Amino acid sequence: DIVLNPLGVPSRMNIGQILETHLGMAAKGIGDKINAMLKQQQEVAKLREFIQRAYDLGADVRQKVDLSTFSDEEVMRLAENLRKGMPIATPVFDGAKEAEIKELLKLGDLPTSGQIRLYDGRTGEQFERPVTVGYMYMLKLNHLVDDKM
Amino acid sequence: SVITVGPYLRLHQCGLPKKMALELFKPFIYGKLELRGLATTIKAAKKMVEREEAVVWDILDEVIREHPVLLNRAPTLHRLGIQAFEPVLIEGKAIQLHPL
Amino acid sequence: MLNTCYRILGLKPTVIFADQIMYTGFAYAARSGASVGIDDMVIPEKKHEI
Amino acid sequence: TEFLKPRLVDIEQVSSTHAKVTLEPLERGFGHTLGNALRRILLSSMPGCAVTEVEIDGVLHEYSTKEGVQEDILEILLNLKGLAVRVQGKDEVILTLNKSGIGPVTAADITHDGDVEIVKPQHVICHLTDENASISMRIKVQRGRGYVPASTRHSEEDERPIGRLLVDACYSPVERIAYNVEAARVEQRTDLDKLVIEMETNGTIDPEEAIRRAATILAEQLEAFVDL
Amino acid sequence: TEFLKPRLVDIEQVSSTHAKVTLEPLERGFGHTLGNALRRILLSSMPGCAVTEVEIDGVLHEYSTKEGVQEDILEILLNLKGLAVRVQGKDEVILTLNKSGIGPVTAADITHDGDVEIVKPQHVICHLTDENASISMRIKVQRGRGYVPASTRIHSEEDERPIGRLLVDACYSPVERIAYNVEAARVEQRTDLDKLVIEMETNGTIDPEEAIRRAATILAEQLEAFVDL
Amino acid sequence: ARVTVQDAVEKIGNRFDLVLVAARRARQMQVGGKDPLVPEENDKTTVIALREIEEGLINNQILDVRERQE
Amino acid sequence: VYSYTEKKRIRKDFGKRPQVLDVPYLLSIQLDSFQKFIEQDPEGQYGLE
Amino acid sequence: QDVVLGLYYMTRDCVNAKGEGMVLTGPKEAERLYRSGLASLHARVKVRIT
Amino acid sequence: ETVINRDGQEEKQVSFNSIYMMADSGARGSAAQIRQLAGMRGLMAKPDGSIIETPITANFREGLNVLQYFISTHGARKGLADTALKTANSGYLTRRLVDVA
Amino acid sequence: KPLVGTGMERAVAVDSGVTAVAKRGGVVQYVDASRIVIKVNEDEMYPGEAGIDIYNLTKYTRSNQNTCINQMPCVSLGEPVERGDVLADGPSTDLGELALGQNMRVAFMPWNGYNFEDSILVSERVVQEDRFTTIHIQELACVSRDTKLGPEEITADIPNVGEAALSKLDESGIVYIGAEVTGGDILVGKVTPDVKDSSLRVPNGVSGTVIDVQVFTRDGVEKDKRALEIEEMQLKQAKKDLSEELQILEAGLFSRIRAVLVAGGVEAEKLDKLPRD
């Protein structure tokens, strides 16, 4: 839905947005998986396992959630609330390393590189180079075009 | 107004929003309209163009064809700050500009 | 390139040539595809040892 | 239903066979679709006639040059590449070209038959020396579809006996096509795709009607399940 | 020579919302030409049915706060926009709903008629929290193609707009996600014959067969003017 | 239509009296105007003069001499 | 831990350092200061008293 | 900024790609080989130009 | 980086890495930016002019310590302030050139 | 919600006072799009006062940057809440977590120069579903002063006007609520007395629907038909709010007195047949 320009990042050095894009693409993958088997009318037991691996993954972390002690109804509510994508919290100077990103991509069915094959909309051909796609959280600023014109 | 990239234009072409184009060239529209006899008085021409009818767009595109406009950023540091272009009528509210 | 043209053919060939350069460059940059990713920035292995 | 039918076609062309055509502004995104379909069909999807095999009386290896010619083997193959012939009836035909003496080797001396129909038979093929230049060879013209690369004719199977040199030739009469789409306006809207096609061929068929043929082809592909 | 004109086979359905269709073997190089053209036509122009105008009895403007319901009216308009309906008899049909008592107001509560069909009766719109929280709205539904905003729907400007009117943006897009794959089909002895498969995601309002038939018809009609001089 | 003056520069190169004589031409082509010497394709007089430079019989030095003719 | 509003949508995080001090009230700079200016503080050295 | 990289990708040369080592009549042929997806955008062909 | 075989043995040639394509083609960036992205960012100097004795040993792709980032803050604040305050003195100079000439 | 965050989103959302936070723990008893009623926990509410909590959420209001504020009840019926728990969500937040923009699906690739240097491409799908469309609230104020040539009247009769212009107006000279006004139209009709139509007109370009109208005046002055009708509407609204508050308090009072009268001797027939009084 959004097509940016790569040439911005090599000079402006704001390379963190690439990692944000990789995490965003990674985060949606867990959401679709839940959306895959939530729409399939699957028993809550199957969910309890999967979300369990989606929360205990990574290195030693301060997060420690016991999914198997809330309820059945609360787990169903969580599944209905996470079907759009599992949120990820990253502390400013205590964030996640690349290994955690790769491990979370393991949980989904997405390429590890973060670059996937694309198709030109008009010509229907294949771009000769893999292109990075992901979910970026962007803002609309107050400089409305109507006020400036 | 704000700018954007029109990567389908020639070196001597710049885009213009329809609203800005009509606002700028309305005095020329009345002269073009009264010459063709569609309107009668200045009030008649003003109320005719106020409704944005069909003939207004084509007569405006006629008068736009050869009437260069001058574009200049606010800090005109050097000699190329003020340049000229031939307008091309487009939809939107941004000055479509050549990349180069 | 443009300079050479400006000193051989004049002005109109140079400007039309520059326009053709822009069009072809845009078209074959879109058709090529050039993305940047973590796997594209390679860290030299010796650096740590250094 | 309630669609914008394209009209206002263009015919002007400043060339013998190099035509450009412009259409009425179509609906959004239809210009790219039609342009892409026409280009992809025209590049590699027509029946056509072209040389496929040439055997030279004297040359055995594809790099073994012969005296009496100022050009090379590769040069003569490129020269005969743009032969631009059309053959009717049988899809396979063989012909012989023999010339002895000095001067250029045109296409008129190809010993034409009733199934060659060569256009502009002044294409340079070879140049000759004083008296030793008595060259002769045979050319096979075949009917095929689109472009076939030399490799796919599988080429390195050693099935050619001595010097039955294969030639990388194209059956498609179209030499180059490129299309642009740009904005155009209607009485109140100003964003409709308008299409222009740059068409040129080798003179075998008229570029004005050539694209028409391609259109008909795609029409056939839709005649199976087109509701009417 | 011949061109092996392809027909359609295996039009089965999998989940009653998206369908996989298969075509008879095509000539070499024709898989990508037809696939892209068909996909673009599908995502471009389809006949679709959607809501445009809604009139709730107890409301002045869209930014009001209707009594009883526990959510604003903007989300009501958004949910009505997201509703998918199928009309068969005519093009313009007016729908009405009436619900009262504690409980969510699902789409099944709509006053369904013989000329209209609801594909998702379990779709929810509003939740009623009071045992006496009567709600009543009139829904205007019509056909169209593409996307039309409310900004250009006020172009009529006949002043036939009472206060109770509410204009919701229309999206006449029965198709959401389309894709296709080219597979090497097995035939008598030819090799250039390869089958094409199209997987299409729909809201449930249009059958895939008539969709692709209309797409091919529109493309042929467009090309009819192209094949001329 | 016409956008560049390279033809004017290459033989009659001057950017000032050229535009002055073009303005003098166009002013009385607009009011009290007569038929031009070249075909018109929905242009005004603000561009017809420059095209007359291309034909050769109208040039910057020609107008200065042609002023004596009038 | 894991309040009812937290159980609604648990946010996964990668935190190695265990926080020891919670984030303070982000307005204590203002409130407390004005709290000194208007309070009925006996023997106040800092106040309208 | 953008067009320069497009032109740079236009003119490169890898050591091996689809459709390399053969010859073409002229620049017109190279356009048709690439557009029909039979040869790579950059190869090691030998073309005749005027 | 690129090592592609051609009929048997492997051969080396210019890399097709996107970052190197941006750097070499001159579209955007230079050797400094590419060095900062992967190699050492470079030892920074205190605003008064003194150069700190502990260079940053980590690139942007890898993690940065809180002190390294904090040390790298005022290195860019000086440049940003210079650019912000340079729009007045420099432009004014042009005025003193226009009146005389 | 932001797919990738920091964990301070909840802190920034709840420490600021824009969102409504449950002051005392308990259970929810009645939810509404404009107000929230919370049945406070028995063991938490101090003796003497045995009422229940009322949270009157705010609605669309003009802000310093003309953006809109509107709280949305993010709770349901019959679910427990804790002390300091989030009950409503204001602008740019949801479920007690900060949310400033939207999470788009983006790809990094040059595309025909439409993203030439810093520009961006947007698919028409996002503008179909209105994922970024915003709401703005503007204030237009018209004052009625008194010059030497008599005070300027706000009457509905004006020379050199058409019936179409006054059709949106009422007979007092002020537009209704919800009438979709256009650029340059008249909202309140005022003339300066020969009368000069010093009325308030919408600035050109901007066009929308009128949300609210407010009237202020000194004591001892005429009140037009619309002035008296809006004053009566405000009186009725205040009376309704007070009546709802007192009836909710009285429901709580009846509950508590029934709870304390269940013991010590209660009349069985009076409990279920006679009214509470």
Curated annotation (Swiss-Prot), chain A:
The RNAP catalytic core consists of 2 alpha, 1 beta, 1 beta' and 1 omega subunit. When a sigma factor is associated with the core the holoenzyme is formed, which can initiate transcription. The rRNA transcription and antitermination complex (rrnTAC) consists of RNAP, NusA, NusB, NusE (rpsJ), NusG, SubB, ribosomal protein S4, DNA and precursor rRNA; S4 is more flexible than other subunits. In pull-down experiments interacts with CedA. DNA-dependent RNA polymerase (RNAP) catalyzes the transcription of DNA into RNA using the four ribonucleoside triphosphates as substrates. Belongs to the RNA polymerase beta chain family. It comes from Escherichia coli (strain K12). Co-administration of salinamide and rifampicin or salinamide and myxopyronin suppresses the emergence of resistance to both antibiotics. The modification N6-acetyllysine is found at residue 106. It comes from the Bacteria. Acetylated on several lysine residues in the presence of glucose. This is DNA-directed RNA polymerase subunit beta.
Swiss-Prot record, chain E:
Changing residue 40 to C: In rpoA112; temperature-sensitive, blocks RNA polymerase assembly. It catalyses: RNA(n) + a ribonucleoside 5'-triphosphate = RNA(n+1) + diphosphate. One of its GO terms (molecular function) is protein dimerization activity. Belongs to the RNA polymerase alpha chain family. The N-terminal domain is essential for RNAP assembly and basal transcription, whereas the C-terminal domain is involved in interaction with transcriptional regulators (such as CRP) and with upstream promoter elements. Homodimer. The RNAP catalytic core consists of 2 alpha, 1 beta, 1 beta' and 1 omega subunit. When a sigma factor is associated with the core the holoenzyme is formed, which can initiate transcription. Both the N- and C-terminus interact with different regions of transcriptional regulator CRP. The rRNA transcription and antitermination complex (rrnTAC) consists of RNAP, NusA, NusB, NusE (rpsJ), NusG, SubB, ribosomal protein S4, DNA and precursor rRNA; S4 is more flexible than other subunits. This is DNA-directed RNA polymerase subunit alpha. It comes from Escherichia coli (strain K12).
Curated annotation (Swiss-Prot), chain F:
It comes from the Bacteria. GO terms for molecular function: bacterial-type RNA polymerase core enzyme binding; DNA binding; DNA-directed RNA polymerase activity. GO terms for cellular component: cytosol; cytosolic DNA-directed RNA polymerase complex; RNA polymerase complex; transcription elongation factor complex. Its EC number is 2.7.7.6. One of its GO terms (biological process) is nitrate assimilation. Keywords: DNA-directed RNA polymerase, Nucleotidyltransferase, Transcription, Transferase. It catalyses: RNA(n) + a ribonucleoside 5'-triphosphate = RNA(n+1) + diphosphate. Belongs to the RNA polymerase subunit omega family. The RNAP catalytic core consists of 2 alpha, 1 beta, 1 beta' and 1 omega subunit. When a sigma factor is associated with the core the holoenzyme is formed, which can initiate transcription. The rRNA transcription and antitermination complex (rrnTAC) consists of RNAP, NusA, NusB, NusE (rpsJ), NusG, SubB, ribosomal protein S4, DNA and precursor rRNA; S4 is more flexible than other subunits. Promotes RNA polymerase (RNAP) assembly. Latches the N- and C-terminal regions of the beta' subunit thereby facilitating its interaction with the beta and alpha subunits. This is DNA-directed RNA polymerase subunit omega. It comes from Escherichia coli (strain K12). The gene is rpoZ. The chain holds residues 2 to 71 of 91 of the full protein.
Curated annotation (Swiss-Prot), chain I:
Disulfide bonds: none annotated. Coiled coil: none annotated. DNA-dependent RNA polymerase catalyzes the transcription of DNA into RNA using the four ribonucleoside triphosphates as substrates. The RNAP catalytic core consists of 2 alpha, 1 beta, 1 beta' and 1 omega subunit. When a sigma factor is associated with the core the holoenzyme is formed, which can initiate transcription. Belongs to the RNA polymerase beta' chain family. This is DNA-directed RNA polymerase subunit beta'. It comes from Escherichia coli O157:H7.
